Amino acid sequence: HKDDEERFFPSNGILIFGKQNAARDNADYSDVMLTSEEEIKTTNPVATEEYGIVADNLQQQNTAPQIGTVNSQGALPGMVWQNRDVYLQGPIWAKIPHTDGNFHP
Amino acid sequence: SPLMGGFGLKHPPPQILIKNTPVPADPPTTFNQSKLNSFITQYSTGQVSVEIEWELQKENSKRWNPEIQYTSNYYKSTSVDFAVNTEGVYSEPRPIGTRYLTRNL
Amino acid sequence: SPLMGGFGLKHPPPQILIKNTPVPADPPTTFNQSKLNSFITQYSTGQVSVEIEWELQKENSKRWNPEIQYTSNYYKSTSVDFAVNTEGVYSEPRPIGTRYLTRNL
Lengths: 105, 105, 105
Hints:
part of a larger assembly, 3 chains, Capsid protein (chain A), virus, AAV8, complex, Capsid protein
């Protein structure tokens, strides 16, 4: 989330840990522990916000400029980001799949 | 990695350029500064050999069931696949890919 | 050469005979010359390892067209061939012969 929006989280964009004796299915919000990646606001875009704005047309004296909202942005040169935080309850490692190519595995 | 497939090389196998050296026809007996455009009609033939050493990655698989393999069809046919026909024309009946063995991700 | 196939050996792998040593139940307290027929009911279990080293004759063939190869069927199926079913039963769906490569006479 961005500043002063701790109540907001991406619908499936955070690690959610269960409290002790939390139900397997349909645990209430009070029975789960939402993580927050707000520390990476400084470098990573907010998960629930658009990446930015791009031009959608060519403005002329008769056509006003139009803007497009970038809701999905792949790697661009000059882009920097932080990885997701690790947690005491969270995983340590994953096997990088044996593939021809990966990006930031 | 090249999009039509294969190996992307910063320094690929160099282009091998070949040309028949022009052999002028009889020039005039009085000097002319103009470049000669009368040439003996000429072509060359020869043999070309290319030897490539390929390194192989052997499959080290614990898969129990048999793998998919490229195989020729057992059933009878008018001509042998990847052979010549009655007119001496060699044909490749299908594009043979490369991915038949399996790996885990 | 054995008629059901395989290698005819004058001195084949020796028969390995195994038996549970009879453990008598309590004999009578007065001597009886008769052989004991009261035995403790008994069975044994264990692990058996057999390691066979096979020598291979590599194919050295100048055949141009692709050979016939044993391959698993690519099309979908309820179960994997040469695997277990939902009940844990391993099955061999077909007899796999040995003659797929070719030689001249």
